[PDB]
Amino acid sequence: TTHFSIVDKDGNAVSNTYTLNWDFGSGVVVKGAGFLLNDEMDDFSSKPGVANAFGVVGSDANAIEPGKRMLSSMSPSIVTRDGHVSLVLGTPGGSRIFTSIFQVLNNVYDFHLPLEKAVAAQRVHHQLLPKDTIYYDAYAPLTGKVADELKAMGYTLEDQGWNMGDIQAIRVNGKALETASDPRGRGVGMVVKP
């Protein structure tokens, strides 16, 4: 999955998340055309209660049916205030996408961090199943006092083996704009004079 965020000089905004699902999708290239096909079908529930590649489960509502869209976690987002775009953001990360956005929103709106720090901050993830398992990435692993405390509570901590999202965000402050690209990835942001 990947995400990008755009604001134009008229205050219009686009937040776009799109994907093949896993890296390089199904691995199938269309001969003669040169593009990869998705492996999005794994976002359906293949069997009730059996976890997919992201550890999430389902039953009837997300079972495979012809013509049906498979449940996603992608959450391209735009915050407005008083009718004006104030923040544009989104991220890849499968079942971690909306918990990662939630954390960034907390960091901006509750901890009042600068956008770059809000995006760079450690992020973790829990999703009921696997039971009492909190995931971290190697960019900002759970360590020291906090990790001992969580383990003492009975949590299992695991390095999920890939970075916890790749937030790409734009903040608008009156007429001024700022960008932030997650240090977990290779993103770039630019402000463009009118």
Binding site: S5, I6, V7, I170, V172, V188, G189, M190, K193
Partner: peptide
Amino acid sequence: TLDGGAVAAPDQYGAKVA
């Protein structure tokens, strides 16, 4: 009417094109 536009993209090429 903002000070400009902006992009945050997941690589340098998307950002340049936007």
